[PDB]
């Protein structure tokens, strides 16, 4: 509904890390929410954006889009400020239709969640080896 | 690793609704590994496909793609066989770098899972409330 701080704990690899996201305001040109972590430098921090197609009279079909990115930076020699070395993206796009009931929409979201913890995707993402 | 019969339990809007996925073989042309459900009709069954980028000596980016799509169909009047009326899609595309370590990929994957279970995105998907 109304976005506020989002706290994630015991996140992965070894459960040693935590992540607190603070709301960063809804973009008014295309309705994209934003969240970010309180980092040292604004140019390098973990960001999340959630976009939901607005309700209208008819619409073709709805869309939910989540898009995260985590930049890793290093202090290069001969420079005084960190520069973003690289970053890993990720995004998920749901494409429900007009007549989709609540139960089946809530089935896809937690089927994806329960599948990202299965051994198959653990091996497919952590070590990057196909099936 | 070698794909097996993935069973997902305790999923869907509440409580328990198991879902046993059986492997459907790799596609040689593009390398997508398919999974499916033991349905009575082959065209009325949920399926998921994973696709990890093939490791090469000079590949300066990797890309994992998981694509769930499940149909729901009612017995159309005037015919003896059911026909697909609508279906729900969901695809996620990770995009790492040639130099990304395991601590980054595991972080991204578990962050996405915890966000899928977050109290914001659950309502943004179930009730389609914009944030």
């Amino acid at each position, epitope marked *: 509904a109304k976005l506020e701080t989002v706290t994630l704990g*015991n*996140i992965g690899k070894d*459960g*040693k890390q935590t992540l607190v996201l603070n709301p960063r305001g809804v973009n008014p040109t295309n309705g994209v929410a934003s969240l970010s972590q309180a980092g040292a430098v604004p140019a390098l921090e973990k960001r999340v954006t959630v976009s939901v197609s607005q309700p209208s009279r008819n619409r073709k079909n709805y869309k939910v889009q989540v898009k995260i990115q985590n930049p890793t930076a290093c202090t290069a020699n001969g420079s005084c400020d960190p520069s973003v070395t690289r970053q890993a993206y990720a995004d998920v796009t749901f494409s429900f239709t007009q007549y989709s009931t609540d139960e089946e929409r809530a089935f896809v979201r937690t089927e994806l*969640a329960a599948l990202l*913890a299965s051994p198959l995707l653990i091996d497919a993402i952590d070590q990057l080896n196909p099936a | 690793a070698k794909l097996e019969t993935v069973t997902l339990g*305790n999923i869907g809007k509440d409580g328990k609704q198991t879902l046993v996925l059986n492997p459907r073989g790799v596609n040689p042309t593009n390398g997508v590994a398919s999974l499916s459900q033991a349905g009575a009709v082959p065209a009325l069954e949920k399926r998921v496909t994973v696709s990890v980028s093939q490791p090469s000596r000079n590949r300066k980016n990797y890309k994992v793609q998981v694509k769930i799509q499940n149909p729901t169909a009612c017995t159309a009047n005037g015919s003896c066989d059911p026909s697909v009326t609508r279906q729900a899609y969901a695809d996620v595309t990770f995009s790492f770098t040639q130099y990304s370590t395991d601590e980054e990929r595991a972080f991204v994957r*578990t962050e996405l899972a*915890a966000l899928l*279970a977050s109290p914001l995105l659950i309502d943004a998907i179930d009730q389609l409330n914009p944030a």
Partner: antibody
Amino acid sequence: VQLQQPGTELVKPGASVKLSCKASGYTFTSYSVHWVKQRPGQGLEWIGSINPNNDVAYFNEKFKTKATLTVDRSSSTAYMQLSSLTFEDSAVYYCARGGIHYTYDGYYFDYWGQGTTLTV
Amino acid sequence: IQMTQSPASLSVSVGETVTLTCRASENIYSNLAWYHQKQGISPQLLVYAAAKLADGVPSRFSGSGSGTQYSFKINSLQSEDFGSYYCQHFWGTPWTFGGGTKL
């Protein structure tokens, strides 16, 4: 739903017996299993924990080089090693299930089984 | 993150409400447990989020907490509520438990 784990075990210092905890009534491969160590007159410790499926292990720093734990899906059992035992190890070892295999919010131990009361 | 609990003994006879706190060191958010054990048997869960009753325990235990300071209280002490209540945090990995306060 019930977790059972003998009553008593005795080793002598140097040896290393593996504690077992059998869980019945809740479809074992869906909830992670946690191990907690209680001294006879002090507080709890939380040795470590794993979940039955995908076998990810969460360890305490102190017990990383002393205990390893595994699962047996066929018999639905959880095993814990304690690879080396000294004199200051006689305690009570509880196995409790808490959580679920795909969420990182609920991890509260709710269904503790009885102890073992190791003696060295 | 190390949790430091508050008075361990608290004495108190069975005629009054009792209130205790379990401080946190580095602002754990509202996710901690309130285990209870009677000596000789395994512990039991009472409050499983901060203010939520766990399964069926009677609604005479109540918890509440700030960003970094949480409290647990009982309305009628009754004869059974003894045995060094414990608190545990689930923010990081260590899940260090608390000191434990007898009654």
